[PDB]
Protein backbone atom coordinates (compact mmCIF):
# COMPACT_ATOMS: atom_id res chain seq x y z
CA UNK A 1 0.00 0.00 0.00
CA UNK A 2 1.01 3.66 -0.61
CA UNK A 3 -0.20 5.86 1.75
CA UNK A 4 -0.52 10.10 2.21
CA UNK A 5 -1.15 12.48 4.89
CA UNK A 6 -1.83 15.90 3.94
CA UNK A 7 -2.24 18.88 6.10
CA UNK A 8 -4.61 21.73 4.84
CA UNK A 9 -3.86 24.83 6.99
CA UNK A 10 -6.16 27.11 5.43
CA UNK A 11 -9.09 24.10 3.55
CA UNK A 12 -12.41 25.34 4.59
CA UNK A 13 -14.44 22.74 6.41
CA UNK A 14 -17.46 23.44 5.55
CA UNK A 15 -19.96 22.66 2.44
CA UNK A 16 -20.56 25.97 1.79
CA UNK A 17 -17.72 25.92 -0.58
CA UNK A 18 -18.02 28.38 -3.86
CA UNK A 19 -16.90 26.26 -7.07
CA UNK A 20 -15.47 29.47 -8.26
CA UNK A 21 -13.23 30.33 -6.10
CA UNK A 22 -12.05 27.25 -5.10
CA UNK A 23 -8.31 28.90 -4.13
CA UNK A 24 -9.21 31.70 -1.99
CA UNK A 25 -12.69 31.61 0.02
CA UNK A 26 -12.11 27.70 0.26
CA UNK A 27 -8.69 27.86 1.34
CA UNK A 28 -6.64 26.71 -1.04
CA UNK A 29 -8.87 23.77 -1.88
CA UNK A 30 -7.86 23.79 -5.25
CA UNK A 31 -4.30 22.56 -4.15
CA UNK A 32 -5.98 19.88 -2.17
CA UNK A 33 -8.04 18.52 -5.51
CA UNK A 34 -4.88 18.22 -7.36
CA UNK A 35 -3.11 16.08 -4.64
CA UNK A 36 -6.11 14.00 -4.70
CA UNK A 37 -6.01 13.54 -8.43
CA UNK A 38 -2.31 13.00 -8.90
CA UNK A 39 -2.87 10.71 -6.02
CA UNK A 40 -5.15 8.27 -7.61
CA UNK A 41 -5.56 8.70 -11.05
CA UNK A 42 -3.43 6.84 -14.05
CA UNK A 43 -4.21 7.03 -18.06
CA UNK A 44 -6.63 3.90 -17.46
CA UNK A 45 -7.71 3.20 -14.10
CA UNK A 46 -7.20 4.40 -10.40
CA UNK A 47 -4.29 3.26 -8.41
CA UNK A 48 -6.16 0.39 -6.04
CA UNK A 49 -3.14 0.64 -3.44
CA UNK A 50 -3.70 4.40 -2.52
CA UNK A 51 -4.81 5.45 0.28
CA UNK A 52 -5.36 9.84 0.35
CA UNK A 53 -5.32 11.45 3.80
CA UNK A 54 -6.80 15.30 4.12
CA UNK A 55 -6.43 16.93 7.17
CA UNK A 56 -8.20 20.01 6.85
CA UNK A 57 -7.71 22.78 9.33
CA UNK A 58 -9.34 25.92 7.96
CA UNK A 59 -12.53 27.54 9.73
CA UNK A 60 -15.64 27.34 10.63
CA UNK A 61 -15.26 23.05 12.07
CA UNK A 62 -11.76 22.20 12.52
CA UNK A 63 -10.18 19.28 12.33
CA UNK A 64 -11.86 17.21 9.48
CA UNK A 65 -10.09 14.57 8.40
CA UNK A 66 -11.37 13.03 4.64
CA UNK A 67 -9.97 9.73 4.11
CA UNK A 68 -10.08 8.34 0.33
CA UNK A 69 -9.46 4.63 -0.02
CA UNK A 70 -8.11 3.90 -3.90
CA UNK A 71 -9.66 0.45 -4.44
CA UNK A 72 -13.18 1.57 -3.33
CA UNK A 73 -13.82 5.20 -5.05
CA UNK A 74 -16.67 5.58 -7.38
CA UNK A 75 -17.77 8.29 -9.58
CA UNK A 76 -14.37 10.33 -9.03
CA UNK A 77 -12.36 11.84 -12.19
CA UNK A 78 -9.16 13.83 -11.98
CA UNK A 79 -10.20 17.21 -12.48
CA UNK A 80 -10.43 19.93 -9.56
CA UNK A 81 -14.05 21.11 -10.17
CA UNK A 82 -15.28 17.03 -9.26
CA UNK A 83 -12.85 16.47 -6.66
CA UNK A 84 -14.04 19.31 -4.91
CA UNK A 85 -17.89 18.26 -5.04
CA UNK A 86 -17.02 15.13 -3.87
CA UNK A 87 -15.57 17.07 -0.87
CA UNK A 88 -18.40 19.23 -0.50
CA UNK A 89 -20.31 16.00 -0.05
CA UNK A 90 -18.14 14.80 2.60
CA UNK A 91 -18.47 17.69 4.67
CA UNK A 92 -22.00 17.96 4.00
CA UNK A 93 -21.97 14.35 5.58
CA UNK A 94 -19.97 15.61 8.34
CA UNK A 95 -22.00 18.43 9.20
CA UNK A 96 -25.65 15.84 9.03
CA UNK A 97 -23.66 14.13 12.43
CA UNK A 98 -23.28 14.47 15.97
CA UNK A 99 -19.85 14.41 17.61
CA UNK A 100 -19.92 10.93 19.14
CA UNK A 101 -20.93 9.94 15.51
CA UNK A 102 -18.09 12.18 14.11
CA UNK A 103 -15.56 9.82 16.26
CA UNK A 104 -16.06 7.08 12.99
CA UNK A 105 -14.65 6.96 9.41
CA UNK A 106 -18.30 8.00 8.21
CA UNK A 107 -18.76 6.59 4.38
CA UNK A 108 -20.10 9.94 2.53
CA UNK A 109 -19.64 8.36 -1.24
CA UNK A 110 -18.18 5.09 -2.12
CA UNK A 111 -14.39 5.30 -0.69
CA UNK A 112 -14.51 8.53 0.37
CA UNK A 113 -15.15 8.52 4.27
CA UNK A 114 -15.21 11.98 6.93
CA UNK A 115 -14.19 11.76 10.30
CA UNK A 116 -13.32 14.16 13.61
CA UNK A 117 -9.69 13.76 13.47
CA UNK A 118 -6.35 15.90 13.74
CA UNK A 119 -2.99 15.10 12.50
CA UNK A 120 -1.25 13.97 15.60
CA UNK A 121 -3.76 11.23 16.52
CA UNK A 122 -3.57 10.17 12.80
CA UNK A 123 -0.02 9.68 12.46
CA UNK A 124 0.30 7.65 16.15
CA UNK A 125 -3.17 6.16 14.22
CA UNK A 126 -0.91 5.30 11.30
CA UNK A 127 2.41 3.58 13.67
CA UNK A 128 -0.09 1.50 15.17
CA UNK A 129 -1.14 -0.30 12.15
CA UNK A 130 3.03 -1.01 11.91
CA UNK A 131 3.36 2.12 8.72
CA UNK A 132 6.35 3.83 8.53
CA UNK A 133 5.92 7.45 8.30
CA UNK A 134 8.58 9.28 6.15
CA UNK A 135 7.91 13.04 5.10
CA UNK A 136 9.22 15.59 3.02
CA UNK A 137 11.30 18.56 3.38
CA UNK A 138 14.80 19.41 2.49
CA UNK A 139 17.63 17.75 4.05
CA UNK A 140 16.48 14.44 3.27
CA UNK A 141 18.08 11.64 1.39
CA UNK A 142 16.22 11.31 -1.75
CA UNK A 143 13.48 8.63 -1.64
CA UNK A 144 15.45 6.52 -4.48
CA UNK A 145 17.85 6.06 -1.94
CA UNK A 146 15.94 5.27 0.61
CA UNK A 147 14.30 1.37 1.35
CA UNK A 148 10.56 1.96 1.52
CA UNK A 149 8.43 -0.24 3.31
CA UNK A 150 4.78 0.13 4.73
CA UNK A 151 4.74 3.89 3.56
CA UNK A 152 2.80 6.79 4.95
CA UNK A 153 4.07 9.73 3.48
CA UNK A 154 3.32 13.24 4.96
CA UNK A 155 2.79 15.86 2.37
CA UNK A 156 2.33 19.92 3.88
CA UNK A 157 0.33 22.40 2.40
CA UNK A 158 1.89 25.78 1.00
CA UNK A 159 2.88 27.53 4.14
CA UNK A 160 4.03 24.17 5.15
CA UNK A 161 3.66 21.71 8.35
CA UNK A 162 4.30 24.13 10.88
CA UNK A 163 7.42 24.18 13.72
CA UNK A 164 5.31 22.84 15.99
CA UNK A 165 4.48 19.52 14.10
CA UNK A 166 7.66 19.18 12.60
CA UNK A 167 9.26 18.15 15.87
CA UNK A 168 6.40 15.46 16.72
CA UNK A 169 7.70 13.94 13.39
CA UNK A 170 11.69 14.25 14.53
CA UNK A 171 10.41 12.63 18.32
CA UNK A 172 8.83 9.76 16.61
CA UNK A 173 11.89 9.46 14.67
CA UNK A 174 9.39 9.67 11.15
CA UNK A 175 12.21 9.48 8.22
CA UNK A 176 13.54 12.57 6.45
CA UNK A 177 12.86 12.37 2.88
CA UNK A 178 13.73 14.62 -0.56
CA UNK A 179 12.84 14.49 -3.91
CA UNK A 180 13.71 17.28 -5.89
CA UNK A 181 16.59 20.19 -5.47
CA UNK A 182 13.32 22.86 -5.81
CA UNK A 183 10.64 23.72 -3.47
CA UNK A 184 7.76 22.01 -5.45
CA UNK A 185 3.74 22.27 -5.03
CA UNK A 186 2.81 19.50 -3.11
CA UNK A 187 0.89 17.42 -5.99
CA UNK A 188 4.19 17.39 -7.60
CA UNK A 189 5.75 15.38 -4.77
CA UNK A 190 3.19 12.99 -4.97
CA UNK A 191 3.74 12.29 -8.46
CA UNK A 192 7.48 12.18 -7.92
CA UNK A 193 7.19 9.58 -5.05
CA UNK A 194 4.72 7.18 -6.80
CA UNK A 195 7.39 7.28 -9.92
CA UNK A 196 10.47 6.27 -7.77
CA UNK A 197 8.30 3.47 -6.52
CA UNK A 198 6.44 2.32 -9.93
CA UNK A 199 9.85 2.09 -11.15
CA UNK A 200 11.08 -0.33 -8.06
CA UNK B 1 15.16 26.54 -22.13
CA UNK B 2 12.71 23.67 -21.46
CA UNK B 3 9.97 23.01 -24.27
CA UNK B 4 7.35 21.49 -24.59
CA UNK B 5 4.35 20.49 -27.48
CA UNK B 6 0.91 18.94 -26.44
CA UNK B 7 -1.53 17.94 -28.36
CA UNK B 8 -5.05 18.33 -27.58
CA UNK B 9 -7.24 16.54 -29.98
CA UNK B 10 -10.75 17.41 -29.01
CA UNK B 11 -9.87 20.20 -27.05
CA UNK B 12 -12.74 22.92 -28.09
CA UNK B 13 -11.61 26.28 -30.70
CA UNK B 14 -14.07 28.51 -29.46
CA UNK B 15 -14.62 30.77 -26.62
CA UNK B 16 -17.80 29.34 -25.66
CA UNK B 17 -15.96 27.36 -22.94
CA UNK B 18 -17.84 26.15 -19.98
CA UNK B 19 -16.05 26.07 -16.95
CA UNK B 20 -18.58 24.07 -15.33
CA UNK B 21 -18.00 20.93 -17.76
CA UNK B 22 -13.97 21.36 -18.57
CA UNK B 23 -13.51 17.70 -19.30
CA UNK B 24 -16.97 16.67 -21.56
CA UNK B 25 -18.37 20.15 -23.58
CA UNK B 26 -14.85 21.24 -23.81
CA UNK B 27 -13.02 18.36 -24.45
CA UNK B 28 -10.61 17.50 -22.30
CA UNK B 29 -9.89 21.02 -21.33
CA UNK B 30 -9.31 20.28 -17.63
CA UNK B 31 -6.44 18.11 -18.60
CA UNK B 32 -4.69 21.00 -20.86
CA UNK B 33 -5.05 23.14 -18.01
CA UNK B 34 -3.58 20.67 -15.61
CA UNK B 35 -0.59 20.42 -18.06
CA UNK B 36 -0.21 24.09 -18.41
CA UNK B 37 -0.67 24.22 -14.88
CA UNK B 38 2.28 21.53 -13.68
CA UNK B 39 4.61 22.63 -16.78
CA UNK B 40 5.21 26.71 -15.13
CA UNK B 41 4.12 26.53 -11.11
CA UNK B 42 6.29 26.19 -8.31
CA UNK B 43 5.87 26.60 -4.61
CA UNK B 44 7.10 30.43 -4.69
CA UNK B 45 7.31 31.12 -8.57
CA UNK B 46 6.94 30.52 -12.32
CA UNK B 47 9.70 28.23 -14.12
CA UNK B 48 11.19 30.69 -16.21
CA UNK B 49 13.09 28.87 -18.56
CA UNK B 50 9.54 27.14 -20.02
CA UNK B 51 7.10 27.43 -22.86
CA UNK B 52 4.76 25.46 -23.55
CA UNK B 53 2.65 25.21 -26.63
CA UNK B 54 -1.13 23.78 -26.85
CA UNK B 55 -2.16 22.46 -30.42
CA UNK B 56 -5.91 22.74 -30.25
CA UNK B 57 -7.43 20.30 -32.82
CA UNK B 58 -11.25 20.27 -31.04
CA UNK B 59 -14.29 21.51 -33.20
CA UNK B 60 -15.73 24.23 -34.46
CA UNK B 61 -12.29 25.72 -36.01
CA UNK B 62 -9.21 24.06 -35.48
CA UNK B 63 -6.38 24.17 -35.61
CA UNK B 64 -5.41 26.91 -33.01
CA UNK B 65 -1.83 26.70 -31.59
CA UNK B 66 -1.49 28.50 -27.89
CA UNK B 67 2.13 29.45 -26.66
CA UNK B 68 2.76 30.02 -23.15
CA UNK B 69 5.93 32.28 -22.46
CA UNK B 70 6.67 31.49 -18.80
CA UNK B 71 9.49 34.48 -18.39
CA UNK B 72 6.36 36.78 -19.25
CA UNK B 73 3.04 35.18 -17.98
CA UNK B 74 0.95 37.68 -15.37
CA UNK B 75 -2.28 37.29 -13.51
CA UNK B 76 -2.51 33.36 -14.11
CA UNK B 77 -2.54 30.64 -11.31
CA UNK B 78 -1.88 26.91 -11.66
CA UNK B 79 -5.81 25.82 -10.72
CA UNK B 80 -8.06 24.52 -13.67
CA UNK B 81 -10.10 27.77 -13.57
CA UNK B 82 -8.26 30.46 -14.01
CA UNK B 83 -5.71 28.96 -16.68
CA UNK B 84 -9.37 27.88 -18.49
CA UNK B 85 -10.48 31.59 -18.01
CA UNK B 86 -6.78 32.36 -19.95
CA UNK B 87 -7.27 29.88 -22.29
CA UNK B 88 -10.97 31.30 -23.04
CA UNK B 89 -9.55 34.65 -23.15
CA UNK B 90 -6.74 33.68 -26.08
CA UNK B 91 -9.88 31.88 -28.28
CA UNK B 92 -11.95 34.92 -28.05
CA UNK B 93 -8.85 37.11 -29.45
CA UNK B 94 -8.19 34.22 -32.14
CA UNK B 95 -12.10 34.73 -32.83
CA UNK B 96 -11.67 38.97 -33.28
CA UNK B 97 -8.60 38.41 -36.18
CA UNK B 98 -8.76 37.45 -39.40
CA UNK B 99 -6.98 34.75 -41.31
CA UNK B 100 -4.13 36.78 -42.12
CA UNK B 101 -3.49 38.05 -38.63
CA UNK B 102 -4.01 34.49 -37.35
CA UNK B 103 -0.39 33.42 -39.34
CA UNK B 104 1.02 35.50 -36.66
CA UNK B 105 1.57 35.42 -32.48
CA UNK B 106 -1.02 37.54 -31.41
CA UNK B 107 -0.45 38.49 -28.00
CA UNK B 108 -4.34 37.59 -25.89
CA UNK B 109 -2.77 38.56 -21.77
CA UNK B 110 1.06 38.70 -20.99
CA UNK B 111 3.01 35.67 -22.06
CA UNK B 112 0.17 34.13 -23.55
CA UNK B 113 0.00 34.49 -27.86
CA UNK B 114 -2.52 32.63 -30.45
CA UNK B 115 -1.59 31.61 -33.90
CA UNK B 116 -3.21 29.11 -36.78
CA UNK B 117 -1.26 26.79 -36.99
CA UNK B 118 -0.99 22.59 -36.43
CA UNK B 119 1.35 20.36 -35.04
CA UNK B 120 3.54 18.88 -37.50
CA UNK B 121 4.29 23.35 -38.67
CA UNK B 122 4.54 23.53 -35.65
CA UNK B 123 7.57 20.85 -34.99
CA UNK B 124 9.17 22.51 -38.13
CA UNK B 125 9.75 25.89 -36.95
CA UNK B 126 11.21 24.20 -33.73
CA UNK B 127 13.44 21.94 -35.97
CA UNK B 128 14.43 25.20 -38.08
CA UNK B 129 15.56 26.66 -34.68
CA UNK B 130 17.49 23.67 -33.41
CA UNK B 131 15.98 22.32 -30.81
CA UNK B 132 16.02 18.34 -30.79
CA UNK B 133 12.86 16.99 -30.24
CA UNK B 134 12.04 14.19 -27.83
CA UNK B 135 8.80 12.22 -27.41
CA UNK B 136 7.85 10.90 -24.44
CA UNK B 137 6.55 7.95 -24.81
CA UNK B 138 6.25 4.84 -22.49
CA UNK B 139 8.34 2.44 -24.21
CA UNK B 140 11.29 4.90 -24.94
CA UNK B 141 14.48 4.28 -24.01
CA UNK B 142 15.01 5.10 -20.16
CA UNK B 143 15.14 8.92 -19.74
CA UNK B 144 17.95 8.50 -17.20
CA UNK B 145 20.33 7.35 -20.08
CA UNK B 146 19.37 9.95 -22.92
CA UNK B 147 21.51 12.68 -23.64
CA UNK B 148 19.19 15.86 -23.27
CA UNK B 149 19.84 19.43 -24.65
CA UNK B 150 17.90 22.13 -26.03
CA UNK B 151 14.62 19.94 -25.89
CA UNK B 152 11.41 19.96 -27.43
CA UNK B 153 9.31 17.66 -25.57
CA UNK B 154 6.29 16.32 -27.05
CA UNK B 155 3.30 15.10 -25.32
CA UNK B 156 0.32 13.80 -26.27
CA UNK B 157 -3.23 13.56 -24.79
CA UNK B 158 -5.30 10.76 -23.16
CA UNK B 159 -6.21 9.49 -26.82
CA UNK B 160 -2.63 10.44 -27.74
CA UNK B 161 0.05 11.52 -30.62
CA UNK B 162 -1.91 8.74 -33.20
CA UNK B 163 -0.39 7.09 -36.10
CA UNK B 164 -0.13 10.19 -38.42
CA UNK B 165 1.91 12.19 -36.38
CA UNK B 166 3.88 9.32 -34.95
CA UNK B 167 5.01 8.35 -38.18
CA UNK B 168 5.76 12.41 -38.76
CA UNK B 169 8.10 11.94 -35.50
CA UNK B 170 9.72 9.27 -36.90
CA UNK B 171 10.56 10.04 -40.20
CA UNK B 172 12.17 13.32 -38.24
CA UNK B 173 14.04 11.44 -35.93
CA UNK B 174 12.48 12.46 -32.40
CA UNK B 175 14.28 10.62 -29.49
CA UNK B 176 11.67 8.00 -28.15
CA UNK B 177 12.03 8.68 -24.20
CA UNK B 178 10.14 6.82 -21.37
CA UNK B 179 9.72 8.04 -17.78
CA UNK B 180 8.13 4.79 -16.47
CA UNK B 181 6.81 1.54 -16.51
CA UNK B 182 3.12 2.93 -16.37
CA UNK B 183 1.40 4.68 -18.21
CA UNK B 184 0.52 8.04 -17.07
CA UNK B 185 -1.62 10.89 -17.63
CA UNK B 186 0.19 13.63 -19.83
CA UNK B 187 0.56 15.88 -16.81
CA UNK B 188 2.54 13.99 -14.64
CA UNK B 189 4.76 13.44 -17.06
CA UNK B 190 5.49 16.89 -17.43
CA UNK B 191 6.11 16.77 -13.95
CA UNK B 192 8.37 13.99 -14.23
CA UNK B 193 11.07 15.68 -17.12
CA UNK B 194 11.09 18.51 -14.94
CA UNK B 195 12.37 16.33 -12.00
CA UNK B 196 14.42 14.89 -14.07
CA UNK B 197 16.21 17.86 -15.02
CA UNK B 198 16.40 19.78 -12.41
CA UNK B 199 18.34 17.08 -10.83
CA UNK B 200 20.30 17.41 -13.83
S1 LIG C 1 5.94 23.60 -0.07
C1 LIG C 1 5.94 24.44 1.54
C2 LIG C 1 4.55 22.45 0.06
C3 LIG C 1 4.92 21.05 0.52
O1 LIG C 1 5.49 20.30 -0.54
C4 LIG C 1 6.56 19.50 -0.08
N1 LIG C 1 7.79 19.87 -0.82
C5 LIG C 1 7.97 21.01 -1.55
N2 LIG C 1 9.20 20.98 -2.10
C6 LIG C 1 9.81 19.83 -1.74
C7 LIG C 1 11.07 19.30 -2.01
N3 LIG C 1 11.93 19.96 -2.77
N4 LIG C 1 11.43 18.08 -1.48
C8 LIG C 1 10.54 17.39 -0.69
N5 LIG C 1 9.29 17.92 -0.42
C9 LIG C 1 8.93 19.12 -0.93
C10 LIG C 1 6.69 19.72 1.42
O2 LIG C 1 6.01 18.67 2.07
C11 LIG C 1 5.94 21.01 1.65
O3 LIG C 1 5.32 21.04 2.91
S1 LIG D 1 -0.82 8.99 -22.36
C1 LIG D 1 -1.53 8.71 -24.01
C2 LIG D 1 -0.57 10.78 -22.39
C3 LIG D 1 0.84 11.21 -22.79
O1 LIG D 1 1.71 11.05 -21.69
C4 LIG D 1 2.99 10.64 -22.13
N1 LIG D 1 3.31 9.43 -21.35
C5 LIG D 1 2.42 8.64 -20.66
N2 LIG D 1 3.11 7.67 -20.02
C6 LIG D 1 4.44 7.84 -20.29
C7 LIG D 1 5.59 7.15 -19.91
N3 LIG D 1 5.55 6.08 -19.13
N4 LIG D 1 6.81 7.59 -20.38
C8 LIG D 1 6.92 8.70 -21.20
N5 LIG D 1 5.78 9.39 -21.57
C9 LIG D 1 4.57 8.95 -21.12
C10 LIG D 1 2.94 10.48 -23.63
O2 LIG D 1 3.39 11.68 -24.21
C11 LIG D 1 1.46 10.37 -23.90
O3 LIG D 1 1.15 10.84 -25.20
C1 LIG E 1 -4.24 12.06 -45.26
C2 LIG E 1 -3.53 11.25 -46.33
O1 LIG E 1 -3.68 11.81 -47.64
O2 LIG E 1 -4.13 9.95 -46.32
C3 LIG E 1 -2.05 11.11 -45.99
C4 LIG E 1 -1.29 10.32 -47.04
C5 LIG E 1 0.21 10.37 -46.82
O3 LIG E 1 -1.61 10.85 -48.34
O4 LIG E 1 -1.69 8.95 -46.98
Redesign the pocket.
Given at each position: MREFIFKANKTITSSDINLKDLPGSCGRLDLLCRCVSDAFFLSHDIRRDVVFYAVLYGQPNPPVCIKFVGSELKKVSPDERNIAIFIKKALKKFEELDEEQRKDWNQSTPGIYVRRLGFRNLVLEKLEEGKNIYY???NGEDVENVDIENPVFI????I??GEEDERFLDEIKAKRI???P?????NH?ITIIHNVLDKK
Open positions: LHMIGDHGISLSLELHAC
